[PDB]
């Protein structure tokens, strides 16, 4: 029902499994052919990733107007790399 994603600095995010599957990488890291530890993604990055998962699951295929996904300037470069690795 849920899963745990752990940042490099130790924070633990419990997110629903369906939401996490939004990431192909995670869908493979786990459920490969529970938990997942990301030694390269920091707390201020992984918190945004999880927020994007709820955002994505809530708005895809929706007639209701969609709001912008906000991204602060300082988080942009690292979020980009995190996003690139997670395939989402």
């Amino acid at each position: 029902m849920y899963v745990k994603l752990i940042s490099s600095d130790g924070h633990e995010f419990i997110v629903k499994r369906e939401h996490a599957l939004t990431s192909g990488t995670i869908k493979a890291m786990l459920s490969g052919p529970n938990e997942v530890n990301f030694r390269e993604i920091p707390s201020h990055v992984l918190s945004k990733v999880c927020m994007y998962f709820t955002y994505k699951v809530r708005y895809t295929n929706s007639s209701t107007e969609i709001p912008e996904f906000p991204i602060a300037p300082e988080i942009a470069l690292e979020l980009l790399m995190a996003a690139n690795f997670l395939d989402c």
Binding site: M1, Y2, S7, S8, D9, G10, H11, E12, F13, I14, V15, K16, H19, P42, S43, H44, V45, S47, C50, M51, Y52, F53, T54, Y55, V57, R58, Y59, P67, F69, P70, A72, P73, E74, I75, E78
Partner: protein
């Protein structure tokens, strides 16, 4: 209306949703299923303001214009039964470079 939360305690942080009409007590229930801890052993806060179990999240200030998917509302969590509940502690997230 669904409300989007980020229940937080000591480097642990749970992402879940619930109805605005849902009650603080039912949220403790959801927490129980996850962190395996009975409602009576947990306290839920909203910025250092202990919440009443009979109150709806709506009443407690969690609304659709405040608990948005892209920007979930935060709920403090504190464990240990009534035999000395720990003080509320939320480890902040790392800090971006630049």
């Amino acid at each position: 209306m669904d409300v989007f939360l980020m229940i937080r305690r000591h480097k642990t942080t749970i992402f879940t949703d619930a109805k605005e009409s849902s009650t603080v007590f039912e949220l403790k229930r959801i927490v129980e299923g996850i962190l395996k801890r009975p409602p009576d052993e947990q306290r839920l806060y909203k910025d250092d303001q202990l919440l009443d179990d009979g109150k709806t999240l709506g009443e407690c200030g969690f609304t659709s214009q405040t608990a948005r998917p892209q920007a979930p509302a935060t709920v403090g969590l504190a464990f240990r039964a009534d035999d000395t509940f720990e003080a509320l502690c939320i480890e902040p997230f790392s800090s971006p470079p630049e």
